[model samples]
Target: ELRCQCLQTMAGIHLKNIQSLCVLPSGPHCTQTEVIATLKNGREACLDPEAPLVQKIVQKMLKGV
Candidate 1:
């Protein structure tokens, strides 16, 4: 978890399932996509946000555009 938090893409996004939760976005069933989407929307709602998991995914998604 600490290692994940220190990484560029995963910084400040440490959840209880920090190691695997991000990858939850890509399962065969919709549960993974739903979980990731909901978490992303919730994170987006924050103004001075602490959650950055979604942002991390976005970076990972873009591969550093």
Candidate 2:
């Protein structure tokens, strides 16, 4: 609960390959936000918040755009 749940993110990913996307915002440890992506291939990966694609993906998901 104290430590951050995510450490790193993938370089890139396709929206179609993603089964689900999660955004984790925690405090008292990392003091940062992390994005989690679940793939259709039954694998999990983290998404870089700094990446343009990731940012766009997050916005699209949250804004329902």
Candidate 3:
């Protein structure tokens, strides 16, 4: 659950919108701790808040019956 939260927050901060498409730019595959570290360091890319991909992922995280 903690890892899930980290991924969501990272996606919110680092999911990019290059060429009008939602893109997660290439980078090292980080562990959960590294992910939060990146956030703390402000090294995550700022993505489009309204990107459908972003919304989809977030919704998936919150999905229920």
Candidate 4:
């Protein structure tokens, strides 16, 4: 909770698309992954990390701009 507040305060914006992943001994784990993504209508969804599309998102984030 503290980390969330700090991140939001530093970014000067609320997190509307939060993604997370877990490290594992074998590979990246996603069984417990949950990404809270908010939509234009204010609806939210929990994106799975193991999903192919979501993997791409994570890869891009790791790749950097």
Candidate whose TM-score is highest: 2
Tens digits of per-residue lDDT for model 4 on 3-59? 221121111212335443333222233324344444456544445445566556556
Count of steric clashes across candidates, in order? 0, 0, 0, 0
Model 3 lDDT per residue over 1-65, tens place: 32232344434432222222223433344333222212334454443344565556445545631
lDDT: which is higher, 2 or 4? 2
Better of 3 and 4 by lDDT: 4
CA lDDT, candidate 4, residue 18: 42
Ranking by lDDT: 2, 4, 3, 1
lDDT of 2 by residue, 1-65 (tens): 35877776677687778778887776777677888899899989988676899878767766864
RMSD in angstroms between candidate 1 and the native structure over all alpha carbons: 13.1
- TM of each candidate vs. truth: 0.22, 0.72, 0.29, 0.37
> Order of candidates by TM-score, top first?
2, 4, 3, 1
lDDT of each: 0.34, 0.77, 0.37, 0.40
With a 3 Å backbone cut-off (N, CA, C), the pairs that clash in candidate 1 are: none
* Model 2 Cα shift for residue 10 (angstroms): 1.8
Off by over 4 Å in 4: 1-31, 58-65
